[model samples]
Target: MSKGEELFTGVVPILVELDGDVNGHKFSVSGEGEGDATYGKLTLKFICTTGKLPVPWPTLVTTFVQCFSRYPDHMKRHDFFKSAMPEGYVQERTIFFKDDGNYKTRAEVKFEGDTLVNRIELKGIDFKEDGNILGHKLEYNFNSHNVYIMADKQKNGIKVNFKIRHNIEDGSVQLADHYQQNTPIGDGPVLLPDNHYLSTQSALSKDPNEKRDHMVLLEFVTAAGI
Candidate 1:
């Protein structure tokens, strides 16, 4: 275990909102819920070395995401590669989408002491869904080395963001639904299942060279009829 691994004891629920402009276009992506915060959890992990030669650069960089369901564990995944920039950086070099879809995602990583912050925005390259569109606009933060909760109401909303940092240790391992269904006007973010319940799997790779992939699984149940 490393110093960073000690930080993530469990899951930290957060309310996050994604809004941004893509290809001179704008979009809003909010969860289904009554309050301001969206329904999500934050966790941390480390990336192990995978290359024959010694790996360079920080390992706590990349982010991976996946989803599944109950009864039978049918899964879907999304991978984010770490690409650096001048002011900030991007965590995507290659992307694979479903339904013959192609897209690009960019994440700007910034840090304040031990607190790591990431501002992410994405768009479709040759999106097969509905023309070129905004993938997502998100801001995430690692508030502290310990358990830090969002208490201030002013700091509570979809706009307020959080970061999920990668734990640099010697280890190896490791969303959708906003349409069709008849959800309430604003009944908070509802967890819909393809078969039984809805589940999401998120993976973090510290070193893009290292195959240290840590996965975080989340399952959600709807409070109201959808």
Candidate 2:
């Protein structure tokens, strides 16, 4: 790939994502964290879900970016880039699936290390077209890492936190004096997040309607010189 592909390496403090397509449903994920040389932790969640499901759905595949880059000063990190998780620095996003065949929506989540907190909220409504997952009718608030999932009748959450992994520093990158946003996570002097697949698949069932509700934690590990 080109230079753009090397944007995030090592344990970056801030990571952002834009529009996403999970099985053709639209959403996003965003994260910002802080830590030292030995251990690091942050918050990750979903933001929004818009529009309908795909037609004649079959077994499918997805490839998306979870780069460790910065956002412009004018932008606000929208919190289903919002989900249910304990808060430190936050990462969030939204998911879309109609109960028409909700069973087939392959939902899965993966985390870089142990997840500190996890919360999944399902209400009487499934995610709707251009609907905001956090502002839905079924809502509750608390001092928790929130991940609100909108489901008609089902909500599933499995939080996994093994002892915090060894820190993979983002090389202590600060918003430098002379660059716009979107700079790579670290320079050669420190660690660079080696791009890899944190991809996971939930169990697949019969066909256009197999009933799959899963989520994969989106995280990264990298190479370091710092």
Candidate 3:
């Protein structure tokens, strides 16, 4: 319905041009932070038309991330987010879903990340190691860090994913939790899977704590327009 950057004026947004090689793939990612960076609108541009890799941006990013987890050293070299800002500028966010009494379908989390620390606390989650369950917390990287991982019983099961697009205060971590016209559904920054999770209760969450995560509350409810 609305188009053009003519709507807003002033700061003009923080834009960074990136051209590098990750996992042997020569790539360029231009990030524009919507001023604030943390929860601000972030737009990324990846040039994939030259037949460089023949794969889409999302798959490429996710694939490389898995690789990064194993070899943090190799990632240290091409780690644009951290390498660019070694001074330690941290960006953080916490979200909580509304409580529905007993049927209280609730959710909440604390996602904090920077040049080094990249973690999300699942608040009051039910953790099971040797088939025994405990109300410990689960973790994942989120916000200005692109990607969401929702799994079943164990960590190695089918996962439902939704892309993330958020600005990171134009510093520390300026990109990642971004997008690529990939939300197979609606528009804007409206989270795709979140909508489904609200309507159907897709992933299983135990109570007494709704044992999935319940650390910091408030971000998820307000952000998604729920």
Best by TM-score: 1
Which digits, one per residue and each the tens of the lDDT, describe model 3 over residues 27-117? 4433222222222222222233223431123222221101111112222222112111222212222211112000011111111222122
Off by over 4 Å in 3: 1-12, 19-23, 37-39, 48-55, 60-226
TM-score, ranked from best to worst: 1, 3, 2
Tell me each candidate's RMSD, in Å, in order: 20.0, 19.8, 21.8
For model 1, the local distance difference test gives 0.24
Superposed Cα deviation of residue 17, candidate 3 (Å): 3.9
In candidate 3 the C-alpha lDDT for residue 189 amounts to: 21
Give one digit per residue, the lDDT tens place, for model 1 in 2-110: 2222222223222223333333444433221111102324343322222221111121122221110111212111000001111222233233333323334444342
User: Who is ahead in TM-score, 2 or 3?
Assistant: 3
TM-score of decoy 3: 0.22
Model 2 lDDT tens row, 1-226: 2232222223434332334343244444332233121121222332233323222111111112222322222221211111221112122222223221121122222233432122222112233433222222211111111111121212322221111111112322111011011111222221122121112212212223423321223332221211
For every model shown, the clashing-pair count is 18, 51, 19
The 0-to-1 C-alpha lDDT of every candidate, in the order given, reads: 0.24, 0.23, 0.22
Candidate with more favorable, higher TM-score: 1 or 2: 1
Report the alpha-carbon TM-score of model 1 versus the true structure.
Answer: 0.28
In candidate 2, which residue ranges exceed 4 Å CA deviation?
1-13, 35-37, 49-226
